[model samples]
Target: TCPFYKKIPGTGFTVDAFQYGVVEGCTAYFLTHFHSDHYAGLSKHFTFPVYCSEITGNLLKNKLHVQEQYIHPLPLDTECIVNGVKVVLLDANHCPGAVMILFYLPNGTVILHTGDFRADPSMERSLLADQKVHMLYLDTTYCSPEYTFPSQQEVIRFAINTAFEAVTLNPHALVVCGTYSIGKEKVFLAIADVLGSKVGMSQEKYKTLQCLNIPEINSLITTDMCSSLVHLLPMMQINFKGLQSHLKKCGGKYNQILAFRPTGWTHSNKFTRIADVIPQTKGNISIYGIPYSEHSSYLEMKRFVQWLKPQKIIPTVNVGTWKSRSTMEKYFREWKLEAGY
Candidate 1:
């Protein structure tokens, strides 16, 4: 099980703590991202100044109404001293403000917390050249060899092209995009530009996108479905009932309804690449789940481990205690035994 609060064995530092209670010797709390899982216990009740990126800081202030005084916004690629530890924030490549934290302790111990991230060559190279990492907090979302998917850029192109082609074939088919609240903005942006249609957005998501301040997102947002046949929807709202209700009201104009889900979970087979549209159709609605995940694939995780070469690898999503013999056996063979656990 993944613990909300993970304390460094010898240091007073903690990363991504859920419970707000601070220990007597606690130094500081660092947040990896704004995801609900990472920001579990964060509330207006939070007392101490929490460390995070500028983008995340803004979200916390505007969305959650957190006080600016309690939120410490750290810039990426910059080093700062916090509670006697040299800390730096690196891009996690997961979300807009997501970051991986590097902590240099007083005792010369180097620790890395890879919040939730996809592997980037440049980011990995910089860390490798910096110093020898003593411990690494790994993101093991897809730790198996079967979870292979290409880069997010390739998947986005596949979705855009597929959506256009699908709409062209069935003139009345409305393209329903399945996505989360924050991520997957690029998918909607590409569809709007290519098809010359304004992307529809619910007021809730519109506020979030506007707050993020992305040029592509800020300019192209609307609540009117008539603006474009392509409709942006949350992943949970992609079910048959949701589409059924939507189509029933405006069923006459469109001949069919097509769905596209942008995620890496769609590709379970080894040979499946980023753009390969695996057919998962139901009734007349054509459904395709593109491999557009922000999480690092199994191969990417292996590469991260190889480059960092940490003395101990502590997976974030562990199944058992630190001495989980079975967990080590399951990952060591694939992630390289030399990386160690």
Candidate 2:
């Protein structure tokens, strides 16, 4: 569950708090991304002025029908003053419109709120390295040591090569890639591009993708089921029963099904590498739970915490339980001590 929505110290602005309604001291609202968990309370009849990335703003209008007047789309890497606070948006590396917000307050305190991000090596060379962040609101989705997994590129390459091999072995096999409404687009897109296959997806998802404005994606999508062997379905529909029913409805156009369930939870510590993990099979359906994650891994989180070395660390996820919160805090303290500050 999400922690109680609160305002940043010394600022009247509230972040990802549309669900909590208007807080007493807050005047403006900030949205990190269009994810339901973060933007749960936002509605079409909302009153407060909302700020977010341009892509997220578009998704808010198209998906949730949030009024355009209240929506403010801020450009990436540019500084803007909102309610007398200097704010800058940086790419979060998690999703298309996701951002890590940097707020420089009047007191010279720098607060960084990472709205669900996957920490990358490139961040060291970015503007973030130049700032002395006082407080860091981290995305601690995988803060435990057991949650380690491979990078996004490695997982995407694995998915593309696996799909290519499956198609080559049996030309009629349907490759279904599971995904959320926004994330995991790269995996399926790579499969479609490398295999020269068209991707089939729901009309609603197609509209959401249109908001993302990926030029290569539009040309690879097809609404007609028969034309595309590679289909993109919701993560919930990647199970054996779901794939079986879907394959039956295909009317023999496809002989078998190969579904990729791409998520962080799929990575088991038992396997040293992602390639060592095996797929589960039932009759004509084969389900592969690949280590494709949009969140930072345990090692990545440690690296990021050490690099920033903020005075205070606040977790944005898994904070509802005392046990979970303390477990993440232990790692934060360990990393901070290692950083010698």
Candidate 3:
């Protein structure tokens, strides 16, 4: 019995699983991603073997490394056994490492757990909504219809266009922006295409970007040899210590900044501070905002729920004590399940 609503330890509801029982005597757990809501708190079954995709392992382990148990690193479509139950991992394209989980309970019940799943209409491939779903956990963050989100690639291009348009006018001008260390490889490629110049990246970044076997994209540079001629140039976080020197002598501190992280870093600070800093230094730098996000929007969430079409769908993000509550409430209301306790 998992105390989901009561926030109790070791029992009641788990948003996705619908039912909960002990796992290998270690509080058995299965997490989808590292988005906090998916695998945070409710410290029941601690030290349990968590099942997850390889990307989730890297994000919460290699990249974040805080929650080593957050990832099981299973292959896509491969079914893995956990605590006597069989689970299948599916691609959930909300982020680079996101995945939707399919669990086969011992009781012959097939449960499809969509932990913050998003749909891509442009690709003409949404979640398989027409399937025979015994149950599904929905993601209803934007269900109210007041939210609009830009695609990750779209946001990257917007920033690139703004910067490029400015740099085109001033040949000697500098351009800088922020990017996440783990994500944004496609964004870099797109920007490179837009700029038509060789982009530079730190050694660490260059190696990571090389993982992309596209073959068509040009490689990144490091020495700042000819940023003006190349389309892309990424900077590290350490080099941009003093603003003026970097913008004038090199470019801007982009090589130094990765993500504009939340918490412990001024959550309430001005939005344009970093972007504004570049131009003030040498009067040649240009910064732009792309309104980027890594999660699904309401419409995307709708598409996701539509695909799964679970007989009973729950939400699994941003609940109060239980982050899955808010989203679950929204979807449950839509399902007209309010009559039940």
Candidate 4:
């Protein structure tokens, strides 16, 4: 957001401050989640009274090693006044501590800022809700119709099944995949839980067992205990080099791994090689692509904007017009899906 856009307040090479926002001046700032991209500049550079939800606050206090007592957090659905503006938190359903913010105004502009939200209806998170939201500053992370996220369960199952099937065939085999700091760990843990109950484990299986009592994932494991049929479970192959050779022996080894992930420039070839695969399913190497995108796609972005129906439709993210704006604007204007104000 710096060097490109400078719309907000509290800016500068200020050893004391970083940027300013018309909203930042709202007396209090609600740190909705613990994502690095959102709170990147907060801890040291900015010095404002920060308010967060209960889960986010606890995460910052324990996981981030931040000062806990000094932190202020309001419970979910509770209302509090900040610089004369009132705010309340609603279940964001994005990740562990994600939130949807409701800013109250007498003018009936109840703004809903949907930040980096992931739709996981399989987890019992309802994308359909009874709340009558008038205006939603929605998360378009996966907005396009083409971009549909398989339930975390489904993707985890596929990854686990692949890993376990490979591992069982070769005890020395090691499997690896990319995952976010928060979610990927859960996938592995879920898998381990599945293996524990199935026919039980052999004494040899007990030897390689690492996380029998992981504190971070105790309850989630137990809750899904009986349903051992879950496909997606966590896989671990911390040994990178050894795993690479084993995968090479496995065919879809590094050579075919790239097909699994979408083509992107920022990724390294060696990494994409692991995701490329050509699994022979039913007679053909069936390679199915899941919409696991964390951002709204073009269609979702349009639907979100249309739902908001804002007069200006100003996009806060990289707001300034870029070379790609003309093309993107074409998509946005198609169904009044977007505008640059």
Candidate 5:
């Protein structure tokens, strides 16, 4: 979706609209997370007040160097007034600092904007279950019937078992996991724990993770290449050429490379089981595209919509094309109708 659509219709608050360049009526800018896409247009030159989670605020200052005076770190699940609007931050479950912003407008309208999220059972127990949300700004990244993937716990277990089997077969095999700057840390971290290896990554990535303030992760990271057999690399470097080059750089220290590219896009309904999906292999390099998604799956999206029963549902993603947008709206209408909205 374009940045223009990110502006809430009746409010001066713009969410994840950094690229929109200080929207005309916007007084406060709300950032959901530290992902590059959401914070694309943000820079040190920003003049408006920024609202986000404490961890996200830390990343804003440390990584992007956004001015401290403009940053406002809101405590999770606590209500705070900003520009006369009552706001609360709820964990988004997508990443460490991501949040689902709940806004109580002066007119008594309640709106919930889910920046990007994975619907967990615990979310049903939150204040959202009792509150009458008038409008819901949903993350429709996988709002389709065919995008059903397994749960995060299941996917992590699969990664752990797969890595264990690979290492058992070949003790010198190097395990590599493709990840983004902030998401998908769980997949690799679980694999590392099961294999008893430290996660090796670039110094820049290490610096970003430090902003997460996860004390346990500190012991699992290492800059030394020889000290850890499992490595974490950018998603673009999980291919045959990239794996081959990575192995060569290690000077034949590893006999073979078993890499995983984890994301929802890698999954399809054509496969009956996650384990049944075959890995692409070339020579000593193997790449498994596992569905370790942070975003909610199709089923999860349906469940959330049915439970919330919001009066109006506004999609935040897949709105660029009429075909895609209509398809998502169709599902929203069906679910809302099912919920007697």
Candidate 6:
């Protein structure tokens, strides 16, 4: 069994398995969300029975063009069986339609796969209350103490307020907020609603969210730049050159431009609290990297590992490397959860 996918010893079940650049060749396959990092490798002509949230299933059929017959919808908190293993889906709380999977192996072992999530306290009532997880597949993306970030809502408010303040300061400035293709909808939508203006997105992002049928997002999405003051673009393309080029095309309709990137990397070094805005301006464009993230912070991961107390801690990101022991050692400090919990 590998970190990304596992082949059941005597059954046809596989978890997040991929082949031909997509997950296939299993009795059942599950997708956490539609983030490209998670699903880009998926085969457009998939044939396996794919289990995901209803929105993800919709994207598979409409966006990826996967046939509808093979896509199965898995709602939260429902129990299903595949290869004789009891399976339950829970909210990962990372993004809309993201999920954490819990599997009750036939041999009485319980396995939990946290599919890229920031923990939710309500988990105690569902997965952690009475069940003892035998093996834990952890999302150790921000596995260092330096990544202690504040609550998501706090960061969202910070970003929303910053967008307004930036526009107020430079009334003619165009505000561009950086976000991932799938996640970070909360920040952009909240800013749009608060400002009483529409938020624009790329066609790819627009098509992705349109499948969800969210009226708030659908009604406001635009392909034009001037339709809205605040524009939401993918984080990778928010550089100075792109912003300058985008504003330049506006033909001086805007004097100044402001960009905000809401991500956890902002907290990698600084001891900043929620609603704290760290400002940086390069090339005369105001850029702010707000402390925001979907993955759990180091402290949050430690807390989760301590409470769950799994028999083994498996870092999902680096499971195959021989250096995994050292990597785990670095992350497991302060709150150590060794084997035999």
Per-model C-alpha lDDT, please?
A: 0.74, 0.85, 0.49, 0.44, 0.87, 0.73
Local accuracy of candidate 2 as per-residue lDDT tens digits, 1-341: 22343468888887888776567777788999888888988879987789999999999898888899999999999989998889999999988999989999899999999999999878877779887999889898888887877778888878888889998999989999987758878888888888887889888888888899677666888788678888988889899988998998889898899998877765374466877767899988999888778899888878888888889988888988999988988888788777898
lDDT of 4 by residue, 98-201 (tens): 67666666565555565555434321323224234444454433323344333455556665576466545554322233333333345445445544422112
Per-model C-alpha RMSD:
3.1, 1.8, 7.8, 9.3, 1.7, 3.0
**Model 6 agreement with the true structure over 238-316: per-residue lDDT tens digits:** 8888788778877778878788777666634465555555677776687877766788877777777877777766676
TM-score of 3: 0.62
User: Per-residue lDDT of 228-304 in model 1, one digit per residue for the tens?
Assistant: 77788788878777777677766487767777777666536466655454666668766776767888887788887
Question: In lDDT terms, how accurate is model 5?
Answer: 0.87
Q: Can you tell me which runs of candidate 3 are displaced by over 4 Å?
A: 1-24, 27-31, 34-50, 57-72, 80-83, 121-130, 151-157, 198-245, 248-285, 321-332, 335-341
How do all models score by TM-score?
0.87, 0.95, 0.62, 0.59, 0.95, 0.87
Can you write out model 3's per-residue Cα lDDT over 105-158, one digit (the tens) per residue? 676667766565555664234234323667766555455454565566655555
Segments in model 1 whose C-alpha atoms lie over 4 Å from true places:
1-5, 20-24, 249-253, 270-278, 282-284, 321-325, 333-341
Candidate 6 similarity to native, TM-score: 0.87
Highest-lDDT candidate = 5
Better of 3 and 5 by TM-score: 5
Off by over 4 Å in 5: 1-4
Residue 153, candidate 5: alpha-carbon lDDT: 84
Q: Number of clashing pairs, model 3?
A: 22
Q: Rank order by lDDT, top first?
A: 5, 2, 1, 6, 3, 4
Q: Can you tell me which runs of candidate 6 are displaced by over 4 Å?
A: 1-10, 20-25, 213-215, 266-268, 271-276, 282-284, 320-324, 329-340
Model 5, C-alpha of 265: deviation from truth (Å) = 2.7
